[PDB]
Amino acid sequence: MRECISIHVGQAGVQIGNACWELYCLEHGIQPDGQMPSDKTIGGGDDSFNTFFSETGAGKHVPRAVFVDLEPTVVDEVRTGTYRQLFHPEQLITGKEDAANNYARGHYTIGKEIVDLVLDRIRKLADLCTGLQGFLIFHSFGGGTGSGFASLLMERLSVDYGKKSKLEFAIYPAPQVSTAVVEPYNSILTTHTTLEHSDCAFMVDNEAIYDICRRNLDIERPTYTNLNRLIGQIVSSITASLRFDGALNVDLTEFQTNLVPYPRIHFPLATYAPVISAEKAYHEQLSVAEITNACFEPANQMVKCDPRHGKYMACCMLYRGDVVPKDVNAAIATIKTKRTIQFVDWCPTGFKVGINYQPPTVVPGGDLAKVQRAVCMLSNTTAIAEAWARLDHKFDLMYAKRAFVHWYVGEGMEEGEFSEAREDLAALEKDYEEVGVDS
Amino acid sequence: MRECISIHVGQAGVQIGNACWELYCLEHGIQPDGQMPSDKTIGGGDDSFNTFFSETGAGKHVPRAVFVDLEPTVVDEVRTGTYRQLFHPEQLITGKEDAANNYARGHYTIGKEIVDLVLDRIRKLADLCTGLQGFLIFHSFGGGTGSGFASLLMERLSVDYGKKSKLEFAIYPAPQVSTAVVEPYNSILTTHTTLEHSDCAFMVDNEAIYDICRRNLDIERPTYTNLNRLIGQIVSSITASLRFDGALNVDLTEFQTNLVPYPRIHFPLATYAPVISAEKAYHEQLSVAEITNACFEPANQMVKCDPRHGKYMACCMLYRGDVVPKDVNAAIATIKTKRTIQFVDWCPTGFKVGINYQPPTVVPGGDLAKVQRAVCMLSNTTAIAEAWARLDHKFDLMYAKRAFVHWYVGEGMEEGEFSEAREDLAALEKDYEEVGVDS
Amino acid sequence: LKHSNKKGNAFIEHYDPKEYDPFYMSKEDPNFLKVIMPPFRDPLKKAQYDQDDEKRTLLQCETGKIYTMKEFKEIEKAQLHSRFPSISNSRQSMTPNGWLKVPMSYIESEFCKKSR
Amino acid sequence: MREIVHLQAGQCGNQIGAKFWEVISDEHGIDPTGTYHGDSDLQLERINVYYNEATGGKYVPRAVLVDLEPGTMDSVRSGPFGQIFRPDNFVFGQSGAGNNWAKGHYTEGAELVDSVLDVVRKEAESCDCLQGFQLTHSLGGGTGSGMGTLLISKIREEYPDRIMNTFSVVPSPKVSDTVVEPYNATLSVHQLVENTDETYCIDNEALYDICFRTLKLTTPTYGDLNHLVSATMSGVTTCLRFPGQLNADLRKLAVNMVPFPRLHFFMPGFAPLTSRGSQQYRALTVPELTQQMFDAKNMMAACDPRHGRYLTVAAVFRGRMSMKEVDEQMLNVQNKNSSYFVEWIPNNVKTAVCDIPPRGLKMSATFIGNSTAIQELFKRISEQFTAMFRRKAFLHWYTGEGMDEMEFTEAESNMNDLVSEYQQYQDATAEE
């Protein structure tokens, strides 16, 4: 039935998958052992957990995900954790040499060495499942493991299954702050692969997370755990109608069919709400209209861009929690007449109504509070094209005199691929500009 | 419905707002926690608190007010109080630099920096409400904060909402006693803004309150607490028909429409009665005629102006407590024939009948006693145009040799604004003289 | 970047009718990234436009004043409004923000209001 | 036997059908188990129309649930009456429609259609003689709209001599659920006007306004709308379910109410729509019912019939009042409201009273009439579809499905012809 397989590449992908799996196990009461030892006081779990987990003959739950990384240090870090008895060692493939934000080695001299193993693993996982819809590939553009290895794997996955959805989730290098220097080097090559060989892609940064957490959660010392919590909550909200039911179920296909207006433009703008702490969720009446209005606020956006610079082509609307249809109708009636929100002279309306009876849960020790309902939005606007343009500017300036290129030359590739990438991105920006221009 | 938004600027504005909110919570039985913990012995609270407070889904009350100040210290002393759990921290915006009796910086280099934040706050508060009629802006002329920041905010509030009432409440620099030196400098600029950009303004001072407390209350060492209490009682009496009902409900629009005879003359003369302490409220029979007669007494006005020097154009009178119509009729018949009170040859009569069934309440630890009924009057006379005369005289005799003006020049403004304000005040005084002159 | 650094703790959600309202790029020239659209001769639309023009010409002959397609449009709009069916109490003309704040939305019975 | 076979399609169609089945079971005294606990007289003779005789007196429903998503059957089975239907009729696929009409009709409408054809056959030959087939669906999706048109075409091809009535849901620009909804509406309307006897117009926004401004409901949801539509259909079919003095049937209404086969749409409506506190303060009489069935406030149309002229009116009553009051009311209405109906055709109102009152309510009457108000909906749909087809947004999915674009061209051509016909028959002049 509605079953998918998750792909986690790189340290960021691995930690994101770990956060997602722990969130799922706590939200469904799944114990870390793998069995149901709650024989005295029950606390839930009688649901359709088959979407992500599997039921054995002995009552055991087996995670269905791919944990592959070129560096064994992350695998060892996960292995010594408290959840090592949940997954299987066969699903965590180690490595001798790694990429570490290098596309050259990780795409030719490193990634090409472990291909058969991961292919056999994913084929076995697919055979173990009945109904397949899409995949959850978790990687990063800065990480070389999540760029070279991810691109090469997704190429064969595309050529092997043309009828299955191919999702994408990674991190975008922020123009202001960054971790390494060679991030655009990897990004310029990974963007072409994710564009000309995938159907949809999700692009997020860390600066927006920092801004929103210091503004709402009011923390002076952030940590990766909260970032992973936010991303996992986003993922759970997106795939909410799959694990449960509701008034209007929205499957993966249902929203991806409309989320892609064109083969070249499939970069939605994700935003989760409410992103609030415990004290920020006690003396604040929460309704639907306010948060939906808050959803379009660029400070709450996951990407540093002004929606007012461009306009909206398509919008995907999601909900989770005790939501009443009349509030949604009132919000839609309110947004359709706002003059601040810009849209095209072409699409009078577009959105979805995903009603989820199951409220989002909380985590003991986290920062999120008990909110009666949640909401997520996925719109499509041309105003986000600035990020690709800044990246292209950086690539041209850093390519004028060939900085840090001789390494890639020695590893062995064609230099013309850089020209191919820049011209492809130029064509993409031209098409985006053409689409954004109205009548 | 009848819901308004209160604005509190400066230390004086903040403390007035605190007194008003504590008075409202004690008069409506609202506990400082914000909920209804009285489960054993009830003591009231079943009324229409929606006018000022808001009801949550959990039985919580959220005040709807704006607490802004450039100096963080006042915000700090409010936060460390016993009522910190009532309001929300987001409504108390601090600041790095302050004005502290200066119009220059607080209007150009200080006030202009925190604008979009307070605009977003007020927009959110207005959206949280359904029915809006007017505002309650609390500031002062002596304080540079409550002068520069108040003028700048009210200008945009006027240009953004024209159909809503714009009230004003501040403190007048007494010609005899004063706190600072540059008070006329701020006042001369604030008056132009409050005249040419507002519909009504209430003007009061402190030495009149000093006189009334030493004469009736008989205190040798007064304090700001009683000053604030009297103003809060005045505010409650003015907006009494909004929170409750009576024989004849008088709303903000009802009295504001008639209280303004001309666009340039909107400075009423308030008078609260009775202003008496405990011992002055036990062996003194209280009726309506006596207090209404005492209302017109100059010794009970909060402005040092002999009413016998000019004459009255419009009078608005209000009542609160167990009042009987026949007493009001007898008082009107008495005053309409008194030769001492002067009025134009033009308005034979004009007044309002505000009957409120709810008697005013008392406070544990205050100086006000339990009185069966109260009365407040808002009249319009030209005899008060004398205060602006001394204000202009002082401004002129300071401005001849340019006393304490190089500071403002260095901060950066036009020097002609002083001439503009002077001539505008001269024109206003001329118009007051022309109106006061009968046929 | 300049706004973010000068205001320090600023985002672009800090939007307000200010001189620094980045919508002002388009305000300089609305024609930029805009294409003129004269009345074209598309036969697909002309299939109905011929009938509409015939009706407009008949109306002009019956009245005696030159009307354009737009002029025609507001003419029959005013005629329909004056015809009596103006529908002022239903969702055919009422604005979206005109149903929540209506006493018909106060399902909470007037009994508790009487108690208050 | 004379029985009616009921068909189901679309999740909204499935839920409204389940609500209708629960309503009729409660009215006719059927327990959730499957036995009979009724205490009436006319609830045993003609009960076989929607049920089937079986052992132990346990009547079974006669309804085929067609869907493409398995999540609907689990939801509808868990209800208080979801254990009484026939699980064999829950023919469900594995892949969702994705709110696509072309994909649902092509991919999910080839290999799954055979089972539903076989079962509807078996039901048809299980009985002696039938009258027609009822299909309640919605145009908001690829399940109800993508499959209902095909099934209606198949049943018409196999059995031409049957009644093809449906209660599909019309879209609204104000209240929308699908981005490509107008495309689906344009595709479905062609089959509705080409291979469908009659069709009733269903709107959710108008029902929401009706409940919000007359019923005064705290938290109105889809359950209320399902209750209202179930009552509407129950009032429609009581002419056959519960015979009285002047009985009618579906084919007579279709023939007498449709002047031209190209125009077969109607406007439903029920009379007593009052608030909860107004139930104990009301006057039960004829003129009040006439006013509530004639005014535009009570009708469930998201338009105004006063813009046009009334074509055909059928006032079906369900109760014990009289016969003179109805005719005098319609006479004086036609006399006074002369500029609201076609002057060329006098006596456009049909009289129909059911002597058998409904269960739980004493007076009830529904409004079936075809007034001139759908022209606005048709014209706005045509405008928005012409727009959407100008630059061809959201078309590559349909193109990749395999079907070409000329279908949209012919559909909009038929659309323009239909709206032209409607507007030039709106001004039905007597002569030159």
Asked if chain A contacts chain B via 3 or more Cβ pairs within 8 Å, the reply is yes
Determine the Cα–Cα distance for residues D168 and D7; give it in Å rounded to an integer: 12
Is residue D111 included in any domain, yes or no? yes
The reply to whether A55 sits in an annotated binding site is no
**Interchain contact, D297 vs C84, CB within 8 Å:** no
Please indicate whether, in this complex, the C-beta atoms of B88 and A285 are within 8 angstroms of each other: no
Do the domain assignments include residue D430? no
Shared-domain flag, residues D240 and D225: yes
Instruction: Give contacts of D74 with chain A, Cβ < 8 Å.
Output: 245
As to burial, measured by CB atoms within 10 angstroms (0-12 exposed, 13-18 middle, 19+ buried), residue D298 is middle
Give me D211's structure tokens: 């409940």
What span, in angstroms and rounded, lies between the C-alpha atoms of D76 and D81? 8
Rounded Cα gap, residues A400 and A406, in angstroms: 14
In this complex, do C13 and A299 lie within 8 Å of one another by their Cβ atoms?
Answer: yes
Contact B117/C at CB under 8 A: yes
Q: What SS3 state is found at B378?
A: strand
Contact B58, B47 (CB under 8 A): no
Whether residue C104 lies within 8 A of chain D, CB to CB, comes out as yes
Name, in order, each residue with C-beta under 8 angstroms of D55's C-beta and a sequence gap of 6 or more. none
Residue found by looking up tokens 């100059």 in the block: B298
Examine the domain organization and report whether D272 and D308 are in the same domain: yes
Name which of D94, D179, D222 is nearest A258 (Cβ-Cβ): D179
**C90 contacts D209? CB cut-off 8 A:** yes
Q: From CA B223, how far away is CA B230, in angstroms rounded?
A: 12
CB contact (8 A) between residue A333 and residue D174 = yes
- Which chains, if any, share at least 3 CB pairs under 8 A with chain C? A, B, D
Residue D178 falls inside a structural domain:
yes
Task: For B67, list phi and psi in degrees, rounded to 5.
Answer: -115, 95
Q: Quick check: is D383 in a domain?
A: yes
Q: Which of residues D225, D257, D289 is at a domain's end?
A: D257
Partner residue opposite D391 with nearest CB, options A245, A346, A349? A346
Task: Count how many domains chain D has.
Answer: 3
Per DSSP bridges, beta strands A169-171 and A202-204 are: parallel
SS3 D428: coil
In degrees and rounded to multiples of 5, residue C4 shows phi and psi of -65, -35
What type of residue sits at position A39? D
* Encoded amino acid at A276, one letter: I
Q: Are residues D419 and D294 in the same domain?
A: no
The SS3 call for residue B380 is strand
| Tokens standing for residue B382 | 């030209």
Q: How many CB atoms lie within 10 A of CB C104?
A: 11
Instruction: Tally the residues of chain A.
Output: 439
Q: What does this entry list as its resolution, in Å?
A: 7.7
**CA of A162 vs chain C CAs: smallest distance (Å):** 38
D416 plus D381 within the same structural domain: yes
- Determine the Cα–Cα distance for residues B199 and A144; give it in Å rounded to an integer: 66
Please give the helix or strand (H or E) that residue B298 lies within, else none.
none
Output the CA torsion C69→C70→C71→C72 (10° steps): 50
Measured distance CA(D101)–CA(D407) in Å, rounded: 13
CATH number, position D344: 3.30.1330.20
**Angstrom distances, CA of residue A407 to CA of A184, A392, A414, C72:** 15, 21, 12, 71
Spatial distance between the Cα atoms of A312 and A382, rounded to a whole number of angstroms: 7
Contact in structure between D403 and D102 (CB atoms under 8 Å): yes
Exposed / middle / buried, residue A177 (Cβ in 10 Å: 0-12, 13-18, 19+) = exposed
How far apart are the C-alpha atoms of A372 and A129, rounded to whole Å? 34
Query: Please, do chains D and B touch (3+ CB pairs < 8 Å)?
Result: no
Nearest CA-CA partner of C16 in D333, A11, A80, B122: B122
Q: Does B155 touch chain C (CB under 8 A)?
A: no
User: Tokens 């008060």 appear where?
Assistant: B384
* Co-location of D185 and D277 in the same domain: no
Picking from B203, B182, B225, B92, the residue whose alpha carbon sits closest to that of residue B140 is B203
Query: CA–CA separation, B281 vs B359, rounded Å?
Result: 15
CA distance B245 to B236: 13
Q: Kindly state whether C66 is in contact with chain A, defined as any CB-CB distance less than 8 angstroms.
A: no
Distances (CA, A) of B394 to B192, B383, B397, D61, D305: 16, 19, 5, 95, 74
DSSP secondary structure code for residue A426 in this structure: H
Residue type, D146: G
Element (H, E) at C72: helix C69-82
User: CB-side exposure of C116: number of CA atoms within 13 Å?
Assistant: 16
B120 touches chain C (CB under 8 A): yes
Q: Contact at 8 Å (CB) between A261 and D393?
A: yes
Q: Residue B218 is encoded by which pair of tokens?
A: 């008989």
CB neighbour class for D397 (10 Å; exposed up to 12, middle 13-18, buried from 19): middle
Residue D178's alpha-carbon distances to A254, B212, D107, in angstroms, are 10, 71, 20
Residue D138 among known ligand-binding residues:
yes
Distance CA B244, CA B356 (A): 7
Question: Mind telling me how many Å the CA of A215 is from chain C's nearest CA?
Answer: 9
Q: Give the residue among A168, A174, A329 at the shortest CA–CA distance from A260.
A: A168
Omega prior to B173 cis, within 30 of 0? no
One-character DSSP codes across A107-119: IIISGGGSSHHHH
Count of helices and strands (H, E) across chain A: 15, 10
- CB of A294 within 8 A of CB of A328? no
Q: Which residue, of D257, D274, D294, is where some domain finishes?
A: D257
Inspect the interface and report whether the beta carbons of B60 and A283 lie closer than 8 Å. yes
Portion 290-319 of A in contact with B at CB < 8 A = 290
At A254, the amino acid letter reads: E
D143 labeled part of a ligand binding site: yes
Q: Which amino acid is at B251?
A: D
D368/D396 same-domain check:
no
D403 shares a domain with D361: no
Cβ contact D152:D28 at 8 Å:
no
Instruction: Name A301's Cβ contacts closer than 8 Å, sequence gap at least 6.
Output: A208, A269, A271, A307
Task: Find out whether A165 and A133 touch, Cβ atoms under 8 Å.
Answer: yes
Measured CA to CA, the distance from residue D218 to residue D236 in angstroms comes to 28
Binding partners of B (≥3 Cβ pairs within 8 A): A, C
DSSP state for residue B359 in the 8-state scheme: P
Q: What are phi and psi of C42, to 5 degrees?
A: -70, 115
Q: Are A241 and A249 in contact (CB under 8 A)?
A: yes
Maximum Cα interatomic distance, chain D, rounded to a whole number of Å: 68
d(CA A282, CA D285): 54
Instruction: Note whether A283 contacts B: Cβ–Cβ < 8 A.
Output: yes
Give the Cα separation of B20 and B15 in Å (integer): 9
CB-CB: which of C1, C13, C100 is closest to A298? C13
DSSP B281: G
Shortest Cα distance, chain B CAs vs residue A285, angstroms? 6
Q: Are A404 and A182 in contact (CB under 8 A)?
A: yes
- In sequence order, the 6+-apart residues with CB closer than 8 A to the CB of B226 are B209, B213, B217, B219, B366, B367
Residue D196 belongs to a domain: yes
Q: Three-state SS across D101-141?
A: HHHHHHCCCCCCHHHHHHHHHHHHHHCCCEEEEEEECCCCC
Residue length, chain D?
A: 432
Longest dimension (CA), chain A: 70
Helix (H, G, I), strand (E, B) or coil at D178: coil
Domain enclosing residue D120, as ranges: 3-257
> Are residue D7 and residue D71 in the same domain, yes or no?
yes
**How far is the C-alpha of C92 from the C-alpha of C86, rounded, in Å?**
9
Contact A290 B88 (CB under 8 A): no
C109 touches chain D (CB under 8 A): yes
The answer to whether residue B127 neighbours chain A at the CB level (below 8 Å) is yes
- Two tokens, residue C19: 């001189």
Place of tokens 């209001």: C113
Burial class (CB in 10 A: 0-12, 13-18, 19+), A54: middle
Residue type at D135? L
The answer to whether residue D432 is domain-embedded is: no
CA D165 to CA D254: how far, in whole Å?
A: 9
Count CB neighbours of C77 within 10 A: 10
CA-based nearest distance A227→chain C, Å: 20
Contact criterion met (CB < 8 Å) for B54 and A284: no
Which pairing describes strands A92-93 and A65-68: parallel, antiparallel, or unpaired?
A: parallel
Which of D269, D155, D275, D161 lies closest to D212 in space, CA to CA? D275
Cα distance between residue A141 and residue A137, in whole Å: 12
* Phi, psi values for residue A395, rounded to 5°: -65, -45
Do the beta carbons of residue D162 and residue D156 sit within 8 Å?
Answer: yes
Known catalytic membership, residue A254: yes
Among the listed residues D190, D207, D196, the one whose alpha carbon sits nearest the alpha carbon of residue D378: D190
In this structure, are D345 and D383 located in the same domain?
no
Six-digit token string for D392: 């061809």
D431 located within any domain: no
* Experimental technique for the deposited model: cryo-EM
User: H helices within D3-100, ranges in order?
Assistant: 11-28, 71-77
Peptide bond preceding D346: is omega within 30 degrees of 0, i.e. cis? no
Which chain A residues touch C37 with a CB distance below 8 Å? 439
Q: For residue D296, tell me if it sits in a domain.
A: yes
Nearest CA in chain D to A336: D174
List, in order, residues 6 or more apart from B165 with CB less than 8 Å away: B133, B134, B135, B199, B200, B252, B253, B256
User: Between chains, do A299 and C97 touch, taking CB under 8 Å as contact?
Assistant: no
Tell me the C-alpha distance between D121 and D123, whole Å: 5
Are D393 and D412 in the same domain? yes
D336/D290 same-domain check: yes
Map A167-190 to HEC letters: CCEEECCCCCCCCCCCHHHHHHHH
Rg (CA), chain D: 22
Longest C-alpha distance within chain B, in Å? 70
**Residues in chain C closer than 8 A to B94 (CB atoms):** none
Facing B116 at nearest CB: one of C16, C101, C116 = C16
DSSP tag of D67: E
Tell me phi and psi for residue B4, to 5 degrees.
-125, 165
Q: Which long-range contacts (CB under 8 A, 24 or more apart) does B150-156 make?
A: B150/B9, B150/B10, B150/B190, B151/B107, B151/B189, B151/B190, B151/B193, B151/B194, B152/B107, B152/B111, B152/B112, B152/B115, B153/B7, B153/B9, B153/B111, B153/B118, B154/B193, B154/B194, B154/B197, B154/B198, B155/B193, B155/B197, B156/B115, B156/B119
Say whether D396 and A263 touch across the interface (CB within 8 A): yes
User: What φ, ψ does residue A138 adopt, rounded to 5°?
Assistant: -110, 115
Residues of B tagged active-site: 254
Work out the number of other CB atoms within 10 angstroms of the CB of residue B253. 12
Domain CATH number, residue D382:
1.10.287.600
Query: Which conformational region is residue A101 in: left (phi greater than 0), alpha (psi within -120 to 50 degrees), or beta?
Result: left
Q: Is position A301 annotated in a ligand binding site? A: no
Distances (CA, A) of B429 to A427, B390, B423: 70, 11, 10
Are D355 and D276 found together in one domain? yes
Beta-carbon contacts of residue D17 (< 8 Å; ≥ 6 apart):
D6, D8, D63, D65, D136
For chain B, what is the total number of helices (H) and then of strands (E)? 15, 9
Entry field: residues in chain C: 116
Backbone phi and psi for residue B265, each to the nearest 5 degrees, phi listed first: -120, 95
Burial code of B372-383, b = ≥16 C-beta within 10 A, e = fewer? ebbbbbbbbbbb
Give the Cα separation of A374 and A245 in Å (integer): 16
Burial D110-144 (b: 16+ CB within 10 A, else e): eebbebbeebbeebbeeeeebbbbbbbbbbbbbbb
Annotated binding-site residue numbers of B for Mg(2+): 71
Q: By C-alpha distance, which of B193, B191, B121, B107 is closest to B158?
A: B193
Question: Is A140 labelled as part of a ligand binding site?
Answer: yes
Whether residue C14 lies within 8 A of chain B, CB to CB, comes out as yes
| Residue B128 near residue B84, CB atoms below 8 Å | no
Q: D43 and D37 in contact (C-beta within 8 Å)? A: no
Of B43, B53, B27, B75, the closest CA to residue B366 belongs to B27
Residue where a domain terminates, one of D241, D257, D273: D257
For residue C34, list chain A residues with Cβ-Cβ distance below 8 A: 437-439
Residue A6, annotated as binding a ligand:
no
Q: Specify the residue for token string 């100086």.
A: B367
Spell out the alpha helix ranges (H) of A275-415: 288-295, 325-335, 385-399, 406-411
- Written as one string, the DSSP assignment of B186-246 is HHHHHHHHHHHS-S--EEE-SHHHHHHIIIII--SS--HHHHHHHHHHHHHHHTHHHHS--
D276 contact C CB<8A? no
Question: Which of A216, A290, A292, A308 to mutate to test binding with chain C, by most C CBs within 10 Å of its CB?
Answer: A308
- Name residues 124-183 of chain D within 8 A of C (Cβ): 174
Test the D interface: residue of C80, C82, C90, C95 with most D CBs within 10 Å: C90
- CATH classification of the domain holding D62: 3.40.50.1440
Contact list, C45 vs chain D (CB under 8 Å)? 386
Interface residue C105 vs chain D (CB under 8 A):
yes
Task: Give me the catalytic one of A27, A77, A207, A254.
Answer: A254
Residues linked to residue B316 through DSSP beta bridges, in sequence order: B378
DSSP symbols for A263-305: TTB---EEEEE----SGGGTSS---HHHHHHHHT-TTTSSSS-
Please name the chains neighbouring A, where neighbouring means 3+ C-beta pairs under 8 angstroms.
B, C, D
Q: Which residue from C minimizes the CA distance to B46?
A: C116
